[PDB]
Amino acid sequence: DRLDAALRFQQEALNLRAQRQEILAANIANADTPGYQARDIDFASELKKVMVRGREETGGVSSPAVDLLYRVPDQPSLDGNTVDMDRERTQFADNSLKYQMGLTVLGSQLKGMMNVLQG
Amino acid sequence: ATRTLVTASTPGADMTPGQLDYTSRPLDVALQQDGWLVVQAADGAEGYTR
């Protein structure tokens, strides 16, 4: 209980990082599909929401209970998709580094605990 | 709004008359400027020509 609660914030943040990267990869895959609005999630609000109330799924075809918001387009396009590649690749790299940061923090905490237990 | 595309178009045709070749034949005729001869078109309809 105590150990589960202490490691729950970073674990949930890392899971939300994984889901956000899945969404960003879906946006990158559909970058040339005509009529596809780019989707993204508000990381902080959804993280607090998952924090207060546990993770839930729409079904389980299954998907998370996250709110898929639409990204504001930069410039218009005749085909009708709002996937701007610069934004997609910047968010992809930023999410990548933040996921690596979450892995580093969680691994440091778990070693910081094995150090105590080991004897 | 930054992206504006190009579309080719053909807005009608040019009605400036050309140069008349004088041929000593009674059946070759030339109309006045902005005048048209009438023929029965291919599909039983009416068409105009120079």
Side-chain angles (χ1 to χ4, degrees):
Chain A
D1 205 354
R2 318 210 41 226
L3 170 148
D4 198 6
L7 271 73
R8 190 219 339 125
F9 182 76
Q10 307 287 333
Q11 194 174 352
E12 293 199 345
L14 172 148
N15 193 9
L16 215 72
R17 285 309 170 179
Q19 311 205 92
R20 193 196 159 181
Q21 189 134 346
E22 171 196 90
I23 297 165
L24 293 180
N27 282 345
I28 289 181
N30 282 107
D32 261 303
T33 293
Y36 174 99
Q37 313 275 292
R39 304 281 201 141
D40 203 358
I41 60 134
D42 186 11
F43 182 77
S45 92
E46 303 289 341
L47 176 61
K48 318 181 152 256
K49 188 184 272 177
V50 166
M51 281 304 287
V52 277
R53 57 144 209 97
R55 343 181 190 246
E56 212 275 320
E57 281 186 357
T58 308
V61 161
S62 58
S63 62
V66 77
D67 313 329
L68 269 191
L69 314 165
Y70 295 96
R71 194 181 261 130
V72 179
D74 309 0
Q75 40 197 340
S77 79
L78 181 70
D79 45 2
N81 83 346
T82 80
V83 175
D84 258 303
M85 218 46 219
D86 324 299
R87 297 289 170 67
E88 274 327 289
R89 299 203 300 294
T90 306
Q91 309 285 320
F92 204 67
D94 191 16
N95 196 7
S96 266
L97 310 174
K98 284 186 177 188
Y99 180 75
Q100 312 212 29
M101 211 275 288
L103 281 173
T104 293
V105 169
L106 198 63
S108 146
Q109 275 179 356
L110 286 168
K111 204 46 200 64
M113 162 75 68
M114 319 284 258
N115 264 337
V116 177
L117 288 188
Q118 178 92 359
Chain B
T2 61
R3 286 203 208 112
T4 282
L5 316 160
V6 162
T7 312
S9 67
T10 63
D14 179 356
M15 310 288 158
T16 320
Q19 307 303 300
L20 299 190
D21 320 304
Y22 174 70
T23 313
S24 310
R25 212 179 80 114
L27 286 169
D28 312 278
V29 308
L31 291 323
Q32 207 158 33
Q33 193 189 10
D34 286 294
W36 299 85
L37 261 158
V38 184
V39 308
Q40 155 172 29
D43 57 14
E46 191 186 60
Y48 314 82
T49 179
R50 303 305 291 276

